Amino acid sequence: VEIPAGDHLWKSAPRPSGSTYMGGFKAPRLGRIRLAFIGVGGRGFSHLAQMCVMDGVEIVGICDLKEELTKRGVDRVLSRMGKSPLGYSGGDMEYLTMLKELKPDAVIISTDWSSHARIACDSMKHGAHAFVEVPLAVSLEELWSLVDTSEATRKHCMMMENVNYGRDELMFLNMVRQGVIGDLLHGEAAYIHCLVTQLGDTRGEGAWRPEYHTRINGNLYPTHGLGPVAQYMNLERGEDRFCRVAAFASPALGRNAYAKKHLPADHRWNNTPFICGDMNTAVVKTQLGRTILVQLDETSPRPYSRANLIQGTEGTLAGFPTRVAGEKLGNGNYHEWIEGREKLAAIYEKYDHPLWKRIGELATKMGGHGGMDFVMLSRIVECLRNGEPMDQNVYEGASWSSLLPLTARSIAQGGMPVEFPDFTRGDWKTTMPLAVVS
Amino acid sequence: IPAGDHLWKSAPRPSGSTYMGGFKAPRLGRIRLAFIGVGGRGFSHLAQMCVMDGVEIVGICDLKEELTKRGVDRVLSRMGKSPLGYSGGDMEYLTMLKELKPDAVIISTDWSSHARIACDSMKHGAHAFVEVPLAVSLEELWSLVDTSEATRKHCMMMENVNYGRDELMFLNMVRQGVIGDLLHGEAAYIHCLVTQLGDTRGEGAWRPEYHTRINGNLYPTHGLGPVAQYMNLERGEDRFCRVAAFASPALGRNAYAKKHLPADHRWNNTPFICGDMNTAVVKTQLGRTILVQLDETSPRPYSRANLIQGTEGTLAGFPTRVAGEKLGNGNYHEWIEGREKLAAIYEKYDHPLWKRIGELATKMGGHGGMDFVMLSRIVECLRNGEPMDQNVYEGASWSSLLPLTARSIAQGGMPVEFPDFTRGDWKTTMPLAVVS
Ligand SMILES: NC(=O)c1ccc[n+]([C@@H]2O[C@H](COP(=O)([O-])OP(=O)(O)OC[C@H]3O[C@@H](n4cnc5c(N)ncnc54)[C@H](O)[C@@H]3O)[C@@H](O)[C@H]2O)c1
Ligand SMILES: NC(=O)c1ccc[n+]([C@@H]2O[C@H](COP(=O)([O-])OP(=O)(O)OC[C@H]3O[C@@H](n4cnc5c(N)ncnc54)[C@H](O)[C@@H]3O)[C@@H](O)[C@H]2O)c1
Numbered sequence: 001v002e003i004p005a006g007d008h009l010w011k012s013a014p015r016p017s018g019s020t021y022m023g024g025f026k027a028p029r030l031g032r033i034r035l036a037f038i039g040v041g042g043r044g045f046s047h048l049a050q051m052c053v054m055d056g057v058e059i060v061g062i063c064d065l066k067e068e069l070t071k072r073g074v075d076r077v078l079s080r081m082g083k084s085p086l087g088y089s090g091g092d093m094e095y096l097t098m099l100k101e102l103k104p105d106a107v108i109i110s111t112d113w114s115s116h117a118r119i120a121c122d123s124m125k126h127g128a129h130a131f132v133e134v135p136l137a138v139s140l141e142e143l144w145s146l147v148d149t150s151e152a153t154r155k156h157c158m159m160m161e162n163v164n165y166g167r168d169e170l171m172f173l174n175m176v177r178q179g180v181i182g183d184l185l186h187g188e189a190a191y192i193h194c195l196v197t198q199l200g201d202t203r204g205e206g207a208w209r210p211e212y213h214t215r216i217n218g219n220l221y222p223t224h225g226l227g228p229v230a231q232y233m234n235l236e237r238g239e240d241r242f243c244r245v246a247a248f249a250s251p252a253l254g255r256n257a258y259a260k261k262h263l264p265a266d267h268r269w270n271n272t273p274f275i276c277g278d279m280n281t282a283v284v285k286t287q288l289g290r291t292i293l294v295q296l297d298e299t300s301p302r303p304y305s306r307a308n309l310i311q312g313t314e315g316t317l318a319g320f321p322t323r324v325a326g327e328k329l330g331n332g333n334y335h336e337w338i339e340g341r342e343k344l345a346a347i348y349e350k351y352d353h354p355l356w357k358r359i360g361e362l363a364t365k366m367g368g369h370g371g372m373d374f375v376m377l378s379r380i381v382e383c384l385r386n387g388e389p390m391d392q393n394v395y396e397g398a399s400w401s402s403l404l405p406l407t408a409r410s411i412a413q414g415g416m417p418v419e420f421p422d423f424t425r426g427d428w429k430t431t432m433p434l435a436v437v438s
Numbered sequence: 439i440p441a442g443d444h445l446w447k448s449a450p451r452p453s454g455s456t457y458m459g460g461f462k463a464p465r466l467g468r469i470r471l472a473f474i475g476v477g478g479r480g481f482s483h484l485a486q487m488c489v490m491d492g493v494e495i496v497g498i499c500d501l502k503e504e505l506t507k508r509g510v511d512r513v514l515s516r517m518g519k520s521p522l523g524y525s526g527g528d529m530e531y532l533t534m535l536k537e538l539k540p541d542a543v544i545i546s547t548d549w550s551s552h553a554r555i556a557c558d559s560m561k562h563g564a565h566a567f568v569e570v571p572l573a574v575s576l577e578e579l580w581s582l583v584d585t586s587e588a589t590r591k592h593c594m595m596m597e598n599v600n601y602g603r604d605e606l607m608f609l610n611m612v613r614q615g616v617i618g619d620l621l622h623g624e625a626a627y628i629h630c631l632v633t634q635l636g637d638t639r640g641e642g643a644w645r646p647e648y649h650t651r652i653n654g655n656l657y658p659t660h661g662l663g664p665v666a667q668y669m670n671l672e673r674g675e676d677r678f679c680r681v682a683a684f685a686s687p688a689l690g691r692n693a694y695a696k697k698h699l700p701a702d703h704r705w706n707n708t709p710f711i712c713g714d715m716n717t718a719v720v721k722t723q724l725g726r727t728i729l730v731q732l733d734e735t736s737p738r739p740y741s742r743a744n745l746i747q748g749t750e751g752t753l754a755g756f757p758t759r760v761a762g763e764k765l766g767n768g769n770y771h772e773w774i775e776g777r778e779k780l781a782a783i784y785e786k787y788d789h790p791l792w793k794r795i796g797e798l799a800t801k802m803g804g805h806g807g808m809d810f811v812m813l814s815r816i817v818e819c820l821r822n823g824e825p826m827d828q829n830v831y832e833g834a835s836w837s838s839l840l841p842l843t844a845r846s847i848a849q850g851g852m853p854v855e856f857p858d859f860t861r862g863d864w865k866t867t868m869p870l871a872v873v874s
């Protein structure tokens with residue numbers, strides 16, 4: 001598994017005259033999206049399963065290294081839609097044959113992190129919009145190649161950050177847009193999720209994800225908690241942008257201890273040291289001076305959390321557990337949290353995002369992390385069919401994912417703040433913020 | 439108020455001075471105690487000290503004559519003997535020190551005078567117990583260390599949060615290895631104090647002015663104290679190494695002044711520069727991280743975070759919650775929280791100090807009882823000639839977050855190094871044990 005490390009992870013040209021800034025880009029309408037999947041493991045098959053019941057979608061091709069996973073996807077589509085997609089398996093470049101033969105309008109890429117950028121760039125160069133699982137890529141050069149390829153091909157490239165479509169995340173966006181918590185000051189983002197048992201897995205994510213902990217000390221998974229907070233703050237879209245980040249890491253102990261406790265002495269995780277600090281902590285500074293706490297711990301034994309805290313001069317909203325407080329909320333007693341299902345009912349009633357009210361009920365029926373997956377996929381289909389911009393542009397996906405190489409650089413440089421590259425080349429200033437859709 | 443480089447700018451220990459780690463003072467069967475500063479906090483300490491055995495409150499000093507009289511009257515009504523009262527000027531406490539020569543003083547003045555009053559008290563032969571933070575600048579903190587080492591008198595910052603029930607229980611659990619090897623801690627002081635801008639009598643008289651002069655963690659000790667002692671920082675095992683600091687925009691207090699105060703008011707003509715939310719990350723020598731945050735402006739619930747995380751579990755406060763392989767059924771995917779589920783955790787891990795005094799401390803009160811536990815330990819240590827649970831170097835290290843975060847912010851967030859107030863002697867300093 002190719003993993004850029006050291007300077008190649010975070011090392012570095014103006015936009016070509018024939019390239020287009022892709023902020024707010026509207027693609028031609030697709031009344032029936034001819035969609036292909038590249039990588040149908042756990043995540044890829046989940047997207048496939050939900051999209052075979054969506055209107056205006058035709059799944060034309062399915063590609064995976066494993067023949068039986070391709071067949072599982074093909075059989076699922078045939079059962080639900082009455083038409084079989086073409087299946088491709090074998091080598092890691094077999095997806096190129098699918099792109100050439102099917103010429104899909106769009107592809108959903110749910111492979112491991114190492115191949116996200118290459119597969120998405122090839123897809124766009126073959127005339128397909130690229131929807132890519134998190135993180136968008138691993139290195140700064142990979143992120144720039146996705147930006148530059150999108151601008152050169154004028155094809156959508158969107159990282160599929162599903163957390164922005166959670167009910168609480170959508171409600172907080174709605175409350176922030178309405179000015180409920182005043183002027184924004186500070187946000188807190190996290191991915192706290194104990195994944196240490198992946199060390200005992202030889203298939204699925206265990207096959208590739210733990211190895212990243214042996215090569216990179218930094219925030220390997222920064223997007224889930226950050227995505228919502230970045231769009232609360234309108235980062236990269238007119239109002240503000242990521243400016244700098246300083247990163248810090250606790251000792252790297254949990255995974256070394258897990259391997260010694262549960263795995264044989266000759267196992268590779270007992271002979272390859274884990275160097276990624278169990279808890280990664282970073283502080284982002286935006287251009288307007290806001291701070292974002294960003295934390296990653298996918299090792300320690302503790303409850304799941306994404307933090308999802310957004311704080312302003314007139315109140316604070318936070319998740320895990322969902323809680324709100326502010327002068328305009330409830331009885332206005334900001335000294336205590338409004339939390340729990342009973343007290344929050346009036347908050348949901350007043351501030352539920354209209355997108356959640358339109359799709360969230362069916363999304364809770366469909367499922368996928370509580371419904372956010374179905375909302376996210378529905379918005380992708382709606383924007384493609386209506387010729388409307390995506391709720392997340394390529395520069396946002398690149399900026400959120402750049403926390404991985406930038407935190408690693410800061411940690412390698414003793415915790416010094418490092419500058420964010422401007423993937424928009426200054427055009428962030430004229431990029432319209434995400435509105436409250438519908 | 440020192441600003442700029444004077445806040446964080448800063449000589450060998452004299453051969454005749456003593457390192458004060460684990461220092462044991464002579465026993466005081468009778469403690470002659472004096473109070474300097476009897477506003478809200480000073481009078482709270484005075485009222486609780488009236489029920490202590492082996493304590494004689496001999497003097498009370500405040501700028502305001504009516505506050506001195508309130509303290510004197512309270513001691514007479516509760517203890518049956520009147521202390522001498524001193525008021526009128528900011529150097530009148532020296533007259534009390536000279537006339538009474540107390541064994542110890544409790545200093546509850548505003549931040550600006552903590553270091554000077556405590557230094558003078560020690561030089562006049564009294565142990566110095568100082569409210570938070572211990573001082574403001576690095577030079578002031580060094581002067582407290584050097585004076586304590588030269589006079590061989592106790593200097594202790596009265597960090598009461600370390601004596602909360604949950605904070606004492608977490609200490610007990612950490613000492614027993616319940617959460618494995620320590621990795622990370624989270625400390626905070628989140629408390630909306632913005633209405634001090636409209637108050638002229640209490641802390642409003644002096645505290646908001648600091649927000650116009652310093653951009654940094656003005657109040658770093660409450661959340662940090664417990665986490666530092668979980669990690670045995672400055673006492674053998676580990677030490678504060680470096681810290682990088684960051685601050686949100688400074689908006690809340692400016693907005694409050696324009697909304698509630700006249701245009702010619704000093705808070706409408708002096709800009710507030712301290713970021714509403716201050717965020718800093720400490721690295722220890724063993725490589726642990728400590729998140730330290732301050733927001734005494736924004737409208738949100740009170741919190742000190744009190745999170746300590748190890749390879750086998752995590753303990754956290756606000757709300758109190760624990761999770762780990764050794765805790766409950768070992769299902770760390772969900773918090774053990776709430777009064778019902780935490781009952782078994784308290785039963786198994788209540789700190790013996792809380793079990794001995796907590797029932798009386800709850801009756802007494804003072805931030806839930808932690809104040810009475812802290813004062814009881816101070817008296818016990820003075821009476822028995824025991825070391826204080828918090829030495830002068832810990833108080834200096836925790837308080838140094840103020841000038842060090844301000845310095846880091848002034849340098850664009852670069853990490854800045856902690857001074858070693860122990861001059862290397864932290865390595866041979868015994869960690870705080872689970873005291874009975
Ligand atoms: N947004 C979410 O909530 C969420 C949930 C799970 C996973 N993910 C992300 O989705 C991605 C995949 O996750 P996963 O759990 O399904 O891992 P997985 O190992 O189960 O699936 C990866 C699949 O991609 C295939 N693959 C790899 N390279 C290929 C190539 N060149 N051509 C064709 N197929 C290829 C593999 O055969 C494999 O089956 C990861 O980036 C992960 O971080 C996101
Ligand atoms: N640990 C806690 O929980 C806690 C609670 C409240 C206050 N505090 C701290 O205690 C200190 C005082 O807080 P406060 O609320 O009582 O403020 P306050 O303004 O009400 O009390 C300060 C008193 O000190 C007096 N004073 C100032 N300079 C003096 C001098 N040279 N000589 C004699 N008296 C002098 C003032 O007259 C005033 O009465 C502060 O450091 C504060 O941060 C701590």
Ligand SMILES: CC(=O)N[C@@H]1[C@@H](O)[C@@H](O)[C@@H](CO)O[C@@H]1O
Binds near residue numbers: 134163
């Ligand atoms: C929303 C969310 O947390 N998604 C994550 C996903 O990104 C991946 O890490 C997975 C691994 O099993 O666990 C979760 O589902």
Ligand SMILES: CC(=O)N[C@@H]1[C@@H](O)[C@@H](O)[C@@H](CO)O[C@@H]1O
Binds near residue numbers: 629660
């Ligand atoms: C333990 C604790 O939080 N103490 C603080 C104290 O330090 C001071 O800031 C006061 C201001 O009114 O509010 C609280 O009591």
